């Protein structure tokens, strides 16, 4: 009724996947030139949505 949030997908990644490749890692993505060190500020994202 209020939304099923138990299904996730990846939005942010370093590159593209190869056929049948699986990646379960949740390592924080750096979109900029500075080490956010897990702090989800500007140019720093959690891979899954």
């Amino acid at each position: 009724v209020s939304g099923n949030y138990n299904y996730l997908y990846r939005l942010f990644r370093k590159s593209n996947l190869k056929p049948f490749e699986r990646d379960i890692s949740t390592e924080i993505y750096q979109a900029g030139n500075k080490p956010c060190n897990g702090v989800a500020g500007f140019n720093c994202y959690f891979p899954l949505r």
């Binding site: 939005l11 942010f12 979109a31 500020g41 500007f42 994202y45």
Partner: protein, 49 residues
């Protein structure tokens, strides 16, 4: 800047959409994109902006 009851609008055309220029405006507070990844902004080309 205009008041919210009477917001302003400008048409953008015939230019190169370099979004790095506007990443030096603030410490950043709100930044959200709909239908487009923050990583693909400096790539896609649009008809009406």
């Amino acid at each position: 800047f205009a008041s919210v009851y009477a917001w302003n609008r400008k048409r953008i055309s015939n230019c190169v959409a370099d979004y790095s220029v506007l990443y030096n405006l603030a410490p950043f507070f709100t930044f959200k994109c709909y239908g487009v990844s923050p990583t693909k902004l400096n790539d896609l080309c649009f008809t009406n902006v």
